[PDB]
Ligand binder design. Structure first.
Ligand SMILES: CN1CCN([C@H]2CC[C@H](n3cc(-c4ccc(Oc5ccccc5)cc4)c4c(N)ncnc43)CC2)CC1
Ligand SMILES: [Ca+2]
Ligand SMILES: [Cl-]
Length: 423
């Protein structure tokens, strides 16, 4: 007999799914993945629920200060998000010490400004050997009344964010009749992009493909990562419709040329690059290939999260983003994507400017033949430019991995020794 509790509110929009509010308890009857079958103790109704909206009772996820399955960088991004103040904290799974936990706290220092520092939690639990607590709760309560060795006294927990609702069960292939393409967002050579609605209940974005231009997509849907755009469903009858999640802030390029994007400081740009590098690192680990990396194929969520789009799509069917071995001999690999990432990095740091300004494609290729590379912008840090340069090496094998680039960009302003604070 398994009993869960609802972490968030939820309004049912399907046939047999269940409505519930936070605090409500339910009885688990079946575990089929994203969708679980349960019975509400409040309404006595039996129906499907999003598994990621509930958790076992009196478990750790049920705590307002515990965030499961979150990395250090993600913790820092969430803590520095709007609606948080000094002392804002969270406890999470250590991503480098499996089985143990870590505490992330929001601090401030006049040199850097608002920061986020992380302490290791050793197992009873303790951060400092002088103070030992029976439970994690005792630890937080302790560090709420004084910092006793910490850089900041604990205040309120980090602002939680309601997760994305799971797509309809077994609804990968859908009939076109279920869609209402409401607004054309953009038009291109190979198709269009619309702001649609699925079954009158879910807002989505659909990429319509011209008939001239399924297996590859069946591969794509397995590439599920926070920094890739989620791929929900597809229409299998020409013209093919690709139904994905709707990114409110549009493409990265247009955002960088927007005014709000023009207000974005340098560390924010670097952060964007870190997210993109993270996603590309995921694709790298999965041994996949993007084949068309650029700010135009990067989308931005309303919360300023960057997600890689159109990955792998170029295969099924921009010399300035293309590596020379890819232009000359058509050799497309992950390293050419590293080159493209260099160019993208230049796009981001120059707020959407077009690469090689005042240069045509063949002119650019001939420049590359001479060993020419783009100069460093005024507002671009030397080290970041070095990263770009390492991305722009003639031999692809000598180009860095997305794992390394991600590691560097994540801790760009943090010394390796200063990742975790010791007490
Ligand atoms: C002048 N600009 C105006 C803005 N136009 C851009 C193009 C349309 C927008 N656009 C495009 C997309 C979009 C949709 C589906 C898609 O399919 C795949 C996803 C992963 C892997 C393979 C395929 C890829 C991308 C998009 C979106 N989802 N949610 C929100 N906006 C979206 C973003 C703006 C480009 C021209
Ligand atoms: Ca420097
Ligand atoms: Cl019962």
């Amino acid at each position: 007999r398994i009993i869960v509790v609802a972490l968030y509110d939820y309004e049912a929009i399907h046939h047999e799914d269940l409505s519930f509010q936070k605090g409500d308890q339910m009885v688990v009857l079946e575990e089929s993945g994203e969708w679980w079958k349960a019975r509400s103790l409040a309404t006595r109704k039996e129906g499907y629920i999003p598994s990621n909206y509930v958790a076992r009772v009196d478990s750790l996820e049920t705590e307002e200060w515990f965030f499961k399955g979150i990395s250090r960088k993600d913790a820092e991004r969430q803590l520095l998000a709007p609606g948080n103040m000094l002392g804002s904290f969270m406890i999470r799974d250590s991503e480098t010490t499996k089985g143990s936990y870590s505490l992330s706290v929001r601090d401030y220092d006049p040199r850097q400004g608002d920061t986020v520092k992380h302490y290791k939690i050793r197992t009873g639990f303790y951060i400092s050997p002088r103070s030992t607590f029976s439970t994690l709760q005792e630890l937080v309560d302790h560090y709420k009344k004084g910092n006793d060795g910490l850089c900041q006294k604990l205040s309120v927990p980090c602002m939680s964010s309601k997760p994305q609702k799971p797509w309809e069960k077994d609804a990968w292939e859908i009939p076109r009749e279920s869609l209402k393409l409401e607004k054309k967002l953009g038009a291109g050579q190979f198709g269009e992009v619309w702001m649609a609605t699925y079954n009158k209940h879910t807002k989505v974005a659909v990429k319509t493909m011209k008939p001239g231009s399924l297996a590859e997509a069946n591969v794509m849907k397995t590439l599920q990562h926070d920094k890739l755009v989620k791929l929900h469903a597809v229409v299998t009858k020409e013209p093919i419709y690709i139904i994905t999640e709707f990114m409110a802030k549009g493409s990265l390029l247009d955002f960088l040329k927007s005014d709000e994007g023009s207000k974005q400081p340098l560390p924010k740009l670097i952060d964007f690059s870190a997210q993109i590098a993270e996603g590309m690192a995921f694709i790298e680990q999965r041994n996949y290939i993007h084949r068309d990396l650029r700010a135009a194929n990067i989308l931005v969520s309303a919360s300023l999260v960057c997600k890689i789009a159109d990955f792998g799509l170029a295969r099924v069917i921009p010399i300035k983003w293309t590596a020379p071995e890819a232009i000359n001999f058509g050799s497309f690999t992950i390293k050419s994507d590293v080159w493209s990432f260099g160019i993208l990095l230049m796009e981001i740091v120059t707020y959407g400017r077009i690469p090689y300004p005042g240069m045509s494609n063949p002119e650019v290729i001939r420049a590359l033949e001479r060993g020419y590379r783009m100069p460093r912008p005024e507002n671009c840090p030397e080290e970041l430019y070095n990263i770009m340069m390492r991305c722009w090496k003639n031999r692809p094998e000598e180009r860095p991995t997305f794992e390394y680039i991600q590691s560097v960009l994540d801790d760009f302003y943090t010394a390796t020794e200063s990742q975790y604070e010791e007490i």
